[PDB]
Write a protein that binds this ligand. Structure first.
Ligand SMILES: Nc1ncnc2c1ncn2[C@@H]1O[C@H](COP(=O)(O)OP(=O)(O)OP(=O)(O)O)[C@@H](O)[C@H]1O
Ligand SMILES: Nc1ncnc2c1ncn2[C@@H]1O[C@H](COP(=O)(O)OP(=O)(O)OP(=O)(O)O)[C@@H](O)[C@H]1O
Ligand SMILES: Nc1ncnc2c1ncn2[C@@H]1O[C@H](COP(=O)(O)OP(=O)(O)O)[C@@H](O)[C@H]1O
Ligand SMILES: [Mg+2]
Ligand SMILES: [Mg+2]
Lengths: 587, 99, 100
């Protein structure tokens, strides 16, 4: 069988010389394979499973078992050959050699009479240099060919389902993802070969920690392959730096430097940071003690593993008036959790006022323009699995946006128009709104009011906002949200704090031109007094600061009174309503 | 990144597994520049790959992998991607891609 | 009391006595919030079909105005999305043994 040997690969001979990876804990699908192969109709099995689960490993284990002689006489004395399509394509460009070498191969196959063929990647052979597809289909229609195929589930349902001719000749066998103990067993099995190749030594603790890290902190790839990839990567790292030894922190830092910045340590220093989270947040957000406390408590509970791993890392509804710190808190959280503001993915829902715009969220249906490009949100989340997703002004979007958005809350995964699945388990979802605060923004009540303006505050405001929102929103959507945070309007004293921060910003603008500004306490008090408004809260302070400082500072800069290498000291003059600012330049 | 890798290899700050390896940047279009007669493109690609295998101390760099799918396809001409697929799957060739 | 009533009704509907033209059962749950209504429905589905996914739950708040009603009963020809059927029907196609 020179033609057969030229265009085929013997798995049995390779198993005899042990060129194949060992297989353990996977006898179920092979037993199903010769369970279904022994029938009279639909005797051709097809292995359907997610890529990487080991369908190739499945047929390899089948070859191992048949070499070991653990199968009844029906499958004995049968030579298994994977059809090397690479052998067929290579060197075949003569005008007629293609499909004719295939004719010799197939005639030898039927002539031998005790042979079995294996076809990996059945998509290239069914429903797809192209006319070779039209040869195998009638052969399976006749029914004398016993072949084993392997195909991804989506490809199998999309292409193999419509081939009605082969529907009566193929039988499906499902392969599921391996459990974590199964992954540990496979890692133990491959320990010997991988240690021999890498000339290193690895321990069981490294195996279990690699498996856990792959299962928890990696979503794009899948368990039965990515743990192997991590250990091989660590072995390569130990080989390139020079008996070598591999420990847990080694693979931990390899994973940390491999994909993003997942956990980047396992010590308690970051835990101490989470203990100081409220103090860290209050360096950018002033006065919102309840909001920071609730957010810190929720994220600390998430970090402790007390939340559902399937669900995302946190869901918050920031309800409050305008200009109180709803977006500043989100920016501070993005800075704290990921080290930069660029980690925040902000979506302005004011551009989603029409239902047909939902297409731009996760791509257009197939066959229409723009299908070649993915969704504007799903792809962006896929690029950065560790990010904070913010939906600014969520009430201004069409309700179909809510219909699509809830799915993230329930199952933490989203399917775009192309059929791909993106995972939202490593993200924090924040939705901001002004609804439910009409009574908090302004209220005097009808009738005489006693001394007061202090109540239980946070609890009653939270309950009122929650009931108003569930009146305005879907009750289940509010029920599934992890937390609803109400932002009270800023008081007066904290305004005097905010001024300082704003002044610092101005100082930065003066550092580019080699200048600087300093203010006295009286000037800061005057700025706080002028820029205070309990209804708006923070932007009027910015307008007042700009008008009273940088207007009449730019004029001085243009006139030449202030030159690079100078400091502008700002003080006050007059008393009462006659107080005014005074600027003096010094070295 | 590949430029710095080449600079490190020539300067001598690489692990002993590489030491003196030659980064060759593949030049598509030059391969296709004269493939008009019978057996011109596939033979060129097989010859260059076999020469790489014979030398052993050569590593290839492809600046556009998206252009690799379909290079000399014709009425026959299985194309370059299909030729590269089998030995790439066999793990007997080391290539670095940029896209 | 509610559990006993539901058990009696299921016994009536699963004894082979009532007309097959009628569905498996029809129940209306009335009560305040925070009581075991959804939990009771989930437990009933779990007992009848051995799975918590055998529960097709639909909120009628989504269909306040009639323009979305057809969305639950298949799109007539000529619409933007007619190639995709309604929500209620295709789920019964995928599983006729479920609690709506
Ligand atoms: N508590 C605060 N601490 C520090 N700066 C604040 C605070 N509240 C508001 N600011 C500042 O005042 C301005 C208010 O904008 P911000 O993004 O906080 O508004 P918002 O609460 O999201 O309101 P809206 O989106 O409803 O207009 C920003 O310049 C912000 O930095
Ligand atoms: N009778 C009950 N027995 C056990 N747990 C209950 C009971 N009632 C409520 N719970 C608990 O409280 C949760 C909320 O109850 P459930 O979802 O059944 O309320 P519901 O009245 O159907 O909802 P809603 O009126 O808000 O639409 C349940 O998931 C369960 O954890
Ligand atoms: N049961 C198993 N025993 C040993 N190794 C396995 C097993 N299942 C999967 N693997 C490993 O997973 C890796 C990827 O599997 P692969 O052969 O690519 O499956 P598929 O071809 O179906 O994607 C292989 O290198 C293999 O060593
Ligand atoms: Mg805002
Ligand atoms: Mg309920």
């Amino acid at each position: 069988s020179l033609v057969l040997d030229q265009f085929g690969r013997n798995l049995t001979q390779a198993a005899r010389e042990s060129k194949l990876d060992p297989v353990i804990g996977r006898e179920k699908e092979i037993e199903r394979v010769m369970q279904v192969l022994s029938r009279r109709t639909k005797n051709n099995p097809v292995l359907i499973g997610e890529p990487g689960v080991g369908k190739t490993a499945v047929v390899e284990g089948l070859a191992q078992a048949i070499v070991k002689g653990e199968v009844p006489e029906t499958l004995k004395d049968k030579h298994l050959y994977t059809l090397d399509l690479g052998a067929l394509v290579a060197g075949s460009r003569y005008r007629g050699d293609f499909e004719e070498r295939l004719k010799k191969v197939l005639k030898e196959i039927r002539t031998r009479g005790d042979i079995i063929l294996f076809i990996d990647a059945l998509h290239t052979l069914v429903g797809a240099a192209i006319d070779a597809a039209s040869i195998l289909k009638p052969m399976l229609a006749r029914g004398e060919l016993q072949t084993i195929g392997a195909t991804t589930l989506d490809e199998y349902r999309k292409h193999l389902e419509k081939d009605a001719a082969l529907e009566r000749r193929f039988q499906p066998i499902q392969v599921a993802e391996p459990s974590l103990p199964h992954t540990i067993e496979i890692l133990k099995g491959l320990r010997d070969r991988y240690e021999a190749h890498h000339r290193v030594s690895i321990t069981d603790e490294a195996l279990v920690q690699a498996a856990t890290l792959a299962d928890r902190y990696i979503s794009d790839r899948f368990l039965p392959d990515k743990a192997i990839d991590l250990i091989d990567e660590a072995g390569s790292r130990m080989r390139i730096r020079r008996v070598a030894e591999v420990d847990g922190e080694l693979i931990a830092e390899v994973l940390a430097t491999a994909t993003g910045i997942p956990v980047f340590k396992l010590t308690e220093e970051e835990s101490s940071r989470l203990l100081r989270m409220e103090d860290e947040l209050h360096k950018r957000v002033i006065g919102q003690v309840d909001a920071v406390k609730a957010l810190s408590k929720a994220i600390r509970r998430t970090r402790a593993g007390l939340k559902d791993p399937k669900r995302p890392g946190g869901s918050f509804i920031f309800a409050g008036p305008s200009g109180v710190g709803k977006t500043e808190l989100s920016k501070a959280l993005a800075e704290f959790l990921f080290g930069d503001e660029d980690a925040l993915i902000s979506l302005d829902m004011s551009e989603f006022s029409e239902k047909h715009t939902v297409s731009r969220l996760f791509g257009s249906p197939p066959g229409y323009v723009g299908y070649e490009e993915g969704g504007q949100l799903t792809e962006k989340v896929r690029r950065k699995p560790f990010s904070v997703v913010l939906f600014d002004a969520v009430e201004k979007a069409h309700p179909d946006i809510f219909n699509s958005l809830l799915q993230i809350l329930e199952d933490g995964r989203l399917t775009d128009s192309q059929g791909r699945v993106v995972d939202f388990k490593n993200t924090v979802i924040i939705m901001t709104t002004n609804l439910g605060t009409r009574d908090i923004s302004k209220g005097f009540n009808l009738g005489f009011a006693a001394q007061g303006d202090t109540k239980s505050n946070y609890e009653r405001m939270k309950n009122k906002v929650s009931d108003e929102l569930k009146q305005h929103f879907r009750p289940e959507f509010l029920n599934r949200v992890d937390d609803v945070v109400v932002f009270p309007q800023l008081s007066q004293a904290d305004i005097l704090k905010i001024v300082d921060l704003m002044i610092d910003k101005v100082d930065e603008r003066l550092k580019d031109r080699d200048m600087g500004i300093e203010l006295s306490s009286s000037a800061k008090e005057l700025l706080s007094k002028k820029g205070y408004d309990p209804v708006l809260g923070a932007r009027p302070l910015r307008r007042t600061i700009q008008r009273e400082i940088e207007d009449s500072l730019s004029e001085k800069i243009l006139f030449g009174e202030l030159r690079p290498g100078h400091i502008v000291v700002v003080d006050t003059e007059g008393e009462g309503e006659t107080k005014t600012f005074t600027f003096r330049g010094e070295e | 990144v590949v430029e710095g890798l080449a600079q490190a290899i020539v300067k001598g700050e690489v692990p002993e597994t590489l030491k003196d390896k030659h980064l060759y940047t593949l030049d598509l279009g030059a391969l296709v520049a004269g493939s008009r007669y019978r057996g011109d493109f596939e033979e060129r690609l097989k010859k260059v790959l076999k020469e790489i295998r014979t030398r052993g101390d050569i590593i290839l760099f492809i600046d556009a992998l998206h252009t690799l799918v379909g290079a000399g396809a014709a009425e026959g001409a299985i194309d370059a991607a299909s030729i590269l697929k089998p030995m790439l799957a066999r793990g007997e060739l080391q290539t670095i891609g940029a896209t």
